[PDB]
Design a binder for this molecule. Structure first.
Ligand SMILES: O=P(O)(O)O[C@H]1[C@H](OP(=O)(O)O)[C@@H](OP(=O)(O)O)[C@H](OP(=O)(O)O)[C@@H](OP(=O)(O)O)[C@H]1OP(=O)(O)O
Lengths: 118, 56
């Protein structure tokens, strides 16, 4: 009826630049004014294709992998109270290292719901 | 006016030194000219070409 889905999209090729520039209109947006009218290219130090062509990538990749693994390695009175020490060996129980692919059982969402509802 | 209405000269109208405001409003026109030429061009182009329904 009025409220209905699509089941097919609108096709392109029949408006403002599609076949004859829509028969050469004299209407143009402010987003269609000249802007960034000069392509910047890669310089010799950046990653120009002259420099990329002779490079052996596997040796450099293995060296950077080795350096990353080496960096990760080198980084790493009232005695009469009715309840005793309840936390004996709880050394913070690393929930903040775990990452869960579930927006309802994540750690960020449990922190969210703990913070924003009292 | 503070430089103009200094001594014996009072606080009447009597002051045409329109060069400053004249420069200010012509420098307005310097930049409003592209904007209005684009806007009036699109106005005339829609009046004489018609409105493109779902073209953009
Ligand atoms: O009434 P005041 O606040 O003292 O200021 C006025 C006011 O200028 P301001 O925009 O600086 O307030 C008048 O402008 P109008 O908005 O009333 O038109 C102006 O008279 P004209 O601008 O019409 O010349 C007049 O100038 P003056 O009274 O010196 O002729 C000037 O008075 P002051 O210079 O004493 O502030």
């Amino acid at each position: 009826t009025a409220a209905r889905p699509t089941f097919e999209p609108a096709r392109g090729g029949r408006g403002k630049g599609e076949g004859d520039l829509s028969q050469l209109s004299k209407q143009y947006s402010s987003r269609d004014l000249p802007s960034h009218t000069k392509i910047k290219y890669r310089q010799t130090t950046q990653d120009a294709p002259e420099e990329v062509r002779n490079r052996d990538f596997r040796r450099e990749l293995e060296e950077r992998e080795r350096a990353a693994a080496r960096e990760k390695n080198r980084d790493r009175w009232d005695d009469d109270v009715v309840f005793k020490n309840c936390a004996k060996g709880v050394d913070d129980q690393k929930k903040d290292k775990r990452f869960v692919n579930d927006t309802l059982r994540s750690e960020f969402h449990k922190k969210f719901m703990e913070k924003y509802i009292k | 006016y503070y430089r103009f209405n200094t001594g014996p000269v009072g606080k009447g109208p009597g002051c045409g030194f329109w060069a400053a405001g004249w420069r200010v409003w012509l420098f307005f026109m310097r930049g409003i000219t592209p904007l209005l030429e684009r806007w009036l061009g699109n106005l005339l182009a829609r009046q004489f070409e018609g409105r493109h329904s779902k073209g953009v």
